């Protein structure tokens, strides 16, 4: 009622997270104006 | 009269070695004691 | 400082200014611009490119 | 040496610019143009002709 508190700077308790992998392998990216997708992965074996 | 001061200090922050590995466990010449200091810095809030 | 003149100009898309965060829209700010209280121009939010999308 | 000026010029067709190994889009790599942060183009990954297709 009468204690008059002053405050001081509070935390604020960062997160350790740094992706890599949103950085690193996965630079491509694409948008889908379609319900699905499709990948090819055609081996190449030539006699 | 005792005035307490509890800064909220996690108590993992304050790691004793007790149990069988504490650090005279381990021989000098093969142990490597970078293991652990990194093990104890993981838990840090920030760069040590 | 290559130059005389240090003055370089950029062109914004209306698109490129508006709300924060998609918000909505007080008195002082609307469509991320935000005025005085006779309705004076002060501040813009303008969004940073965002192409590609994501 | 058998000019006084050894400078010439070459025109490129646009289907001769674009992602090198036909990589995807990035936000400074886009249609092989390398451009810096402020948008001005800094690099072309030109490829030569496809034809023929050996």
New interface residues.
Partial sequence: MYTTAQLLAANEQKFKFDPLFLRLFFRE?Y?FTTEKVYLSQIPGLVN | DPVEVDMGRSEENNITQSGGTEWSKRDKSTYDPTDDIEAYALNASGVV | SSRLFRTQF?MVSPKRISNPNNTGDSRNCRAGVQINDSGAALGYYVSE?G????
């Fill in positions: 990216s948008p | 950029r490119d192409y590609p999308g994501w």
